Amino acid sequence: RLVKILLLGAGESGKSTFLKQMRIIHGQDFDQRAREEFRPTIYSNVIKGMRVLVDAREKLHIPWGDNKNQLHGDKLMAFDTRAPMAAQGMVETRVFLQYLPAIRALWEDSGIQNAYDRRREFQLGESVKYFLDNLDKLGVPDYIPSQQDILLARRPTKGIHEYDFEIKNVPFKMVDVGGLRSERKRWFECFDSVTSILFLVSSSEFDQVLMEDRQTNRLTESLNIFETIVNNRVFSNVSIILFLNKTDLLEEKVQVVSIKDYFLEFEGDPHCLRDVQKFLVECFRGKRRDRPLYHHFTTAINTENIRLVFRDVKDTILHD
Amino acid sequence: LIIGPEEESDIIFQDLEKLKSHPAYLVVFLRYILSQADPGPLLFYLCSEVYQQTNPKSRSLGKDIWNIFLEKNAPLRVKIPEMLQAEIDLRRNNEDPRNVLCEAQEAVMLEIQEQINDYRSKRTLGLGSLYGENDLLGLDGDPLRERQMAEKQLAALGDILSKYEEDRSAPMDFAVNTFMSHAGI
Numbered sequence: 001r002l003v004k005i006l007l008l009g010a011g012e013s014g015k016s017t018f019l020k021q022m023r024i025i026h027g028q029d030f031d032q033r034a035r036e037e038f039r040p041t042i043y044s045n046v047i048k049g050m051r052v053l054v055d056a057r058e059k060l061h062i063p064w065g066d067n068k069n070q071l072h073g074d075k076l077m078a079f080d081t082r083a084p085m086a087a088q089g090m091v092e093t094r095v096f097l098q099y100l101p102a103i104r105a106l107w108e109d110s111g112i113q114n115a116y117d118r119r120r121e122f123q124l125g126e127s128v129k130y131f132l133d134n135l136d137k138l139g140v141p142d143y144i145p146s147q148q149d150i151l152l153a154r155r156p157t158k159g160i161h162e163y164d165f166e167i168k169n170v171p172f173k174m175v176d177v178g179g180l181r182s183e184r185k186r187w188f189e190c191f192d193s194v195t196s197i198l199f200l201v202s203s204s205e206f207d208q209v210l211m212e213d214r215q216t217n218r219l220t221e222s223l224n225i226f227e228t229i230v231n232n233r234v235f236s237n238v239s240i241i242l243f244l245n246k247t248d249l250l251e252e253k254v255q256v257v258s259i260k261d262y263f264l265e266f267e268g269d270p271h272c273l274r275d276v277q278k279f280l281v282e283c284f285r286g287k288r289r290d291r292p293l294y295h296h297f298t299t300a301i302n303t304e305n306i307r308l309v310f311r312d313v314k315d316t317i318l319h320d
Numbered sequence: 321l322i323i324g325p326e327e328e329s330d331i332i333f334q335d336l337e338k339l340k341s342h343p344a345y346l347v348v349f350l351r352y353i354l355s356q357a358d359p360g361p362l363l364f365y366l367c368s369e370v371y372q373q374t375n376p377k378s379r380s381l382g383k384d385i386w387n388i389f390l391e392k393n394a395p396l397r398v399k400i401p402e403m404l405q406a407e408i409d410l411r412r413n414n415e416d417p418r419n420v421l422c423e424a425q426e427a428v429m430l431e432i433q434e435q436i437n438d439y440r441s442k443r444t445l446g447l448g449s450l451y452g453e454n455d456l457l458g459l460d461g462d463p464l465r466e467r468q469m470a471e472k473q474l475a476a477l478g479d480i481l482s483k484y485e486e487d488r489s490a491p492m493d494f495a496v497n498t499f500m501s502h503a504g505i
């Protein structure tokens with residue numbers, strides 16, 4: 001009677017974002033008040049992300065673009081990340097504004113920028129770039145996060161978030177669990193009456209390592225995860241749909257990095273999006289041991305793209 | 321180095337001899353096996369273990385082991401060196417097979433190891449709970465208490481068995497209980 005869909009995938013694959021799209025596309029959406037609650041999360045993304053940047057500039061021994069920015073880097077590093085509000089990923093507006101000037105200078109520095117280009121060597125979401133490039137609008141006193149801002153804001157998912165919605169008189173329940181290794185121990189609590197599983201993967205994580213242990217390749221982790229889910233007989237009658245998310249990022253990445261340097265099996269033009277997308281797809285099908293497998297190239301932050309992709313997902317699931 | 325923006329029982333699970341003595345842990349492993357892999361090897365190993373410890377008299381068991389795991393069209397046929405199979409089959413002469421049946425058990429051990437390494441990898445992915453590992457939380461090195469959780473756990477197997485045809489689910493259930501019973505569950 002109910003269509004229960006589980007969103008599975010390693011950390012930072014796009015689950016919480018997809019869930020937000022459902023609310024935007026089929027639910028009540030986010031009114032000004034509800035968007036206003038993301039501001040503390042957004043100012044926290046920015047401050048903490050920049051702190052990681054100056055720290056990487058130092059330890060990676062990358063030189064400043066301008067020495068006078070050493071003072072700004074000092075200001076940021078002095079920010080206590082473990083204080084109560086900061087510990088829960090939130091920063092008041094008044095505090096954010098005190099750091100704005102320094103943050104703006106640090107982001108104009110070529111050293112900090114070079115550090116960003118090498119984020120694969122550490123841990124940093126490209127969503128901090130989206131906000132650093134929009135400091136002007138986050139700065140203004142009466143700033144209210146846009147829909148696009150809300151979608152980009154990054155909040156870890158420790159816990160189980162459930163969202164209920166309807167489409168043409170059909171009740172739907174989507175479940176989002178965390179994807180960090182430590183969070184997965186809870187995945188078993190949500191498998192009762194599951195109709196379909198949407199397996200998300202950041203298609204552009206081939207050059208990165210896990211945040212859990214900074215030594216394991218991200219794609220590799222995804223594949224091993226998919227492997228244990230897709231071959232579990234208990235899910236024999238469950239629809240497994242594969243989402244190769246962050247297509248927009250892969251489109252950028254293939255032009256400066258080559259998947260060839262991380263996965264030998266690759267043969268084709270590493271500078272070509274279509275070639276890398278097929279390799280990724282084959283890699284996940286290759287893990288099956290048998291039931292068909294449908295896949296989709298998505299961009300979770302793109303509302304219009306998720307609108308039509310889900311259209312296919314709904315009809316697929318509804319015809320099983 | 322370089323700050324982040326956000327930020328045992330392995331001993332029992334990696335060794336088959338200590339996993340056999342811990343029924344609660346074994347049941348979890350049998351769950352993984354029955355769901356993610358070939359049940360043959362392990363199930364053949366356990367029944368053959370009951371034989372090796374069962375007093376010669378034992379015949380019936382050995383007979384069922386042959387039809388379920390070793391003979392031509394066996395439902396859960398396991399793959400062992402042909403020589404060893406012909407010899408086991410001979411001991412027809414109703415003689416002592418334990419000696420050659422133990423070699424069959426060792427031949428299948430490499431496969432059981434791969435699967436052990438396999439599940440440990442899954443535990444690393446933090447997915448141990450997907451196989452009942454969460455039922456091990458409140459346990460302490462005490463025979464009687466642990467083997468109490470063995471039951472209830474052993475009932476959560478029907479959930480995976482039932483999704484197997486009768487000519488396979490039947491022998492499986494037969495195999496599991498044969499060893500569980502010998503372990504006292």
Ligand SMILES: Nc1nc2c(ncn2[C@@H]2O[C@H](COP(=O)(O)OP(=O)(O)O)[C@@H](O)[C@H]2O)c(=O)[nH]1
Nearest residue numbers: 012013014015016017127151152154246299300
């Ligand atoms: N550019 C881009 N960003 C994305 C995409 N999908 C998710 N994100 C962002 O990636 C970060 C991690 O996303 P999240 O949904 O929290 O991943 P989760 O940990 O699996 O829930 C967030 O900042 C998202 O806004 C995408 O297709 N493209």
Ligand SMILES: [Mg+2]
Nearest residue numbers: 015016157177
């Ligand atoms: Mg999440």
